[PDB]
Amino acid sequence: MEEGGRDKAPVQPQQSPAAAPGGTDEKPSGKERRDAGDKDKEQELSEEDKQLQDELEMLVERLGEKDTSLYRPALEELRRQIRSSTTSMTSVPKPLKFLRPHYGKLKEIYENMAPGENKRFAADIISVLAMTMSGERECLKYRLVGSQEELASWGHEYVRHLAGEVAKEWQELDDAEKVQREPLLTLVKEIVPYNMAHNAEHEACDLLMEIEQVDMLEKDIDENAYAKVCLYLTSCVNYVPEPENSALLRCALGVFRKFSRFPEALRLALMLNDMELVEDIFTSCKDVVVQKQMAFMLGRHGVFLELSEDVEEYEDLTEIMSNVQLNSNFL
Amino acid sequence: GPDAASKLPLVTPHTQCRLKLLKLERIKDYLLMEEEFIRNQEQMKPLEEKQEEERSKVDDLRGTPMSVGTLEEIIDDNHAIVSTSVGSEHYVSILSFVDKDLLEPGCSVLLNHKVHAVIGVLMDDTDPLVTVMKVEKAPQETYADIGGLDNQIQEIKESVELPLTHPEYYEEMGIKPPKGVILYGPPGTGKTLLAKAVANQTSATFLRVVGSELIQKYLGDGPKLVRELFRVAEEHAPSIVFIDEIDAIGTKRYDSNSGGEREIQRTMLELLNQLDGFDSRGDVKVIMATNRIETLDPALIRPGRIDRKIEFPLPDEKTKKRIFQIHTSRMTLADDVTLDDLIMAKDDLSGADIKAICTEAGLMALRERRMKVTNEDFKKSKENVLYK
Ligand SMILES: Nc1ncnc2c1ncn2[C@@H]1O[C@H](COP(=O)(O)OP(=O)(O)OP(=O)(O)O)[C@@H](O)[C@H]1O
Numbered sequence: 001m002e003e004g005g006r007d008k009a010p011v012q013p014q015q016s017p018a019a020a021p022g023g024t025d026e027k028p029s030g031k032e033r034r035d036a037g038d039k040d041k042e043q044e045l046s047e048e049d050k051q052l053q054d055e056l057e058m059l060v061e062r063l064g065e066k067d068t069s070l071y072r073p074a075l076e077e078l079r080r081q082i083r084s085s086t087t088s089m090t091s092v093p094k095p096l097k098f099l100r101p102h103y104g105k106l107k108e109i110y111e112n113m114a115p116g117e118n119k120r121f122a123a124d125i126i127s128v129l130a131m132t133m134s135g136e137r138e139c140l141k142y143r144l145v146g147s148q149e150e151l152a153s154w155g156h157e158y159v160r161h162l163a164g165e166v167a168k169e170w171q172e173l174d175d176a177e178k179v180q181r182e183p184l185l186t187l188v189k190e191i192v193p194y195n196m197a198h199n200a201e202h203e204a205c206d207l208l209m210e211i212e213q214v215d216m217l218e219k220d221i222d223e224n225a226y227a228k229v230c231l232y233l234t235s236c237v238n239y240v241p242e243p244e245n246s247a248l249l250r251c252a253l254g255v256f257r258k259f260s261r262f263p264e265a266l267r268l269a270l271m272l273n274d275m276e277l278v279e280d281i282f283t284s285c286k287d288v289v290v291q292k293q294m295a296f297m298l299g300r301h302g303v304f305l306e307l308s309e310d311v312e313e314y315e316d317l318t319e320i321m322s323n324v325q326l327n328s329n330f331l
Numbered sequence: 332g333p334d335a336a337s338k339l340p341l342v343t344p345h346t347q348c349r350l351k352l353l354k355l356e357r358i359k360d361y362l363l364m365e366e367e368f369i370r371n372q373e374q375m376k377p378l379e380e381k382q383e384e385e386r387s388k389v390d391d392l393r394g395t396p397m398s399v400g401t402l403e404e405i406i407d408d409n410h411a412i413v414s415t416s417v418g419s420e421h422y423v424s425i426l427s428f429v430d431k432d433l434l435e436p437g438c439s440v441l442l443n444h445k446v447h448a449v450i451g452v453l454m455d456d457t458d459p460l461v462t463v464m465k466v467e468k469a470p471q472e473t474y475a476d477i478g479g480l481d482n483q484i485q486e487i488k489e490s491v492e493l494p495l496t497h498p499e500y501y502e503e504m505g506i507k508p509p510k511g512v513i514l515y516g517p518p519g520t521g522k523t524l525l526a527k528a529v530a531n532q533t534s535a536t537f538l539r540v541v542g543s544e545l546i547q548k549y550l551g552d553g554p555k556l557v558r559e560l561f562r563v564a565e566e567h568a569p570s571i572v573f574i575d576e577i578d579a580i581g582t583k584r585y586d587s588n589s590g591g592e593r594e595i596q597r598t599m600l601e602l603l604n605q606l607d608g609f610d611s612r613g614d615v616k617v618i619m620a621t622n623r624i625e626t627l628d629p630a631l632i633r634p635g636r637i638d639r640k641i642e643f644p645l646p647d648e649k650t651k652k653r654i655f656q657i658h659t660s661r662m663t664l665a666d667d668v669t670l671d672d673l674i675m676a677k678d679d680l681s682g683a684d685i686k687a688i689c690t691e692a693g694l695m696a697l698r699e700r701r702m703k704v705t706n707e708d709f710k711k712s713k714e715n716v717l718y719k
């Protein structure tokens with residue numbers, strides 16, 4: 001409500017923005033020219049956070065709360081030019097002016113249209129532009145719809161394309177500890193169709209970088225502990241970690257083989273067609289990995305013995321494995 | 332024992348990671364079932380209230396005139412022998428209401444006044460010895476204030492302060508930190524200054540004892556205080572014990588010493604054990620300061636007892652100027668005294684002499700009700716301090 005020292009700056013350039021209500025008549029061409037040139041220079045002084053408090057931001061915060069509530073649906077007309085400018089000012093006041101319990105009626109304000117190419121605007125910023133608000137909104141509205149009205153129009157499937165885009169850029173934004181931020185959003189959404197959502201997320205992330213996928217597996221261990229009371233996510237939840245660690249990733253497969261044991265260790269349909277896939281990891285940790293899985297070891301020789309040619313030695317190797325190398329070496 | 336706070340200091344996420352949320356909600360469900368779990372059973376079984384009924388019955392079992400006595404021995408559980416108020420010993424019966432854990436052989440016991448038995452332990456009053464050496468906080472001397480000594484501040488930092496702030500370094504190379512530090516130099520070099528500097532930026536109970544109080548009046552009340560000194564240090568978690576003027580345990584003779592030198596030696600033989608004996612050590616670091624490192628038994632300084640020996644020399648000329656600047660920082664000089672001219676007043680000034688000059692300078696300005704020291708004040712200050 002007051003300014004000091006730099007009072008001259010916020011006086012002259014503000015009359016035109018305040019003259020918009022009175023400039024819409026008798027000056028059809030004046031408004032368009034000014035807007036085009038102002039856009040280019042605005043970004044230069046905004047990307048720098050050299051001022052702790054934003055003087056310009058607070059000026060519009062007041063009239064924007066009530067003016068936008070009824071003005072947005074006043075026209076309800078789709079225009080090529082107006083839409084681009086209108087979406088610009090919606091995101092700016094969301095963090096502060098909008099209170100926490102306000103996204104219930106916000107479905108129709110953002111789902112209808114996208115903010116053009118905000119992807120470039122979401123890359124320079126780290127975690128304060130829209131990451132906090134975007135995730136929270138979908139955690140409530142979606143759940144109620146699926147309780148009794150899971151069948152809806154094509155709008156539900158549109159958001160699927162949105163999810164894949166975000167994950168492709170967050171990981172490499174800083175390579176810092178913020179990389180683990182992405183998994184949180186995907187957990188809440190698509191409780192039942194979790195596998196389909198995860199398939200797209202890991203399809204592109206793995207290819208971009210090779211070794212930066214190991215850290216992701218760590219967050220999966222603790223996630224499964226806080227499971228649901230109902231016995232419905234005890235099998236689906238355990239299948240997601242497998243495809244990522246396949247040939248699409250590093251061929252170590254040390255953790256891949258262990259991942260098969262989670263689904264109650266149904267050995268008849270997890271690794272029964274897995275040992276012979278490589279045929280060149282005999283000396284690797286493949287043998288050691290199974291040595292900690294005493295659940296279906298009795299049936300191991302049922303198929304291995306019949307081979308008689310996949311291994312250079314097939315009879316002597318099994319004999320010296322049970323306890324020959326355990327007690328003798330220590331003593 | 333148990334800590335009231337810090338229920339689960341799992342700040343590893345250190346962010347908005349959802350892992351923080353899952354654990355918190357877990358307690359909420361457990362709390363909900365407990366609510367109706369207690370009150371429900373508290374109606375059809377109105378035997379014990381647990382809030383007013385529980386305390387009430389025990390009080391009646393107790394006595395209005397609760398007694399205070401010393402537990403003398405621990406006979407089989409539920410039974411003990413407690414010394415009465417004056418001189419009698421009773422084969423009392425221990426009641427289960429007591430924690431049955433704090434029953435150390437000789438601390439304290441509350442007994443019923445008619446059927447004497449164990450009713451409850453009593454916390455022991457802070458012994459006056461602990462308060463005597465329990466330095467709270469170094470008043471003003473900081474660690475950049477010391478000035479001058481630079482290569483000698485790293486040794487003390489690296490022996491009594493690093494292993495407590497960054498243990499990883501003596502955690503990955505498997506090397507135990509140097510046991511102790513002994514400071515030796517001419518009279519007045521910052522030996523105690525560095526000693527109290529470490530007390531400033533430290534997170535451990537600092538204890539200080541001068542070598543002169545280690546020599547006492549009655550025989551045997553010698554190497555018994557040394558046992559008490561290291562008994563308090565162990566009881567108080569990490570702690571740095573500072574022995575100042577160690578060269579007073581056989582350098583100065585006092586008539587109060589019933590036994591002569593022969594008694595003082597046994598104090599050293601007990602101090603030798605307390606630094607490296609076949610008992611466990613724990614976490615206690617000894618800093619010894621002296622002005623004559625050649626007048627003490629060369630076994631107290633044996634590696635293992637005290638490992639790092641730090642030598643304090645008389646200030647260098649360059650360091651002499653720094654000493655004057657730090658001591659004269661908060662002084663409204665009269666832009667007529669030159670520090671460099673007073674740097675060379677005597678062949679070797681300890682540095683404690685420098686503060687003496689800068690302190691007697693003020694007293695020589697107070698006499699004239701003047702808040703600015705002139706060259707005359709310092710000139711007469713440099714003559715009244717290091718001359719007579
Ligand atoms: N190198 C120094 N740097 C800063 N102050 C010093 C230095 N040497 C001595 N002093 C000052 O000397 C004053 C009085 O002597 P001080 O307490 O330093 O003695 P000391 O060196 O520990 O000697 P001693 O072991 O004989 O007591 C202290 O308040 C301290 O500020």
Ligand SMILES: [Mg+2]
Binds near residue numbers: 523620
């Ligand atoms: Mg001293």
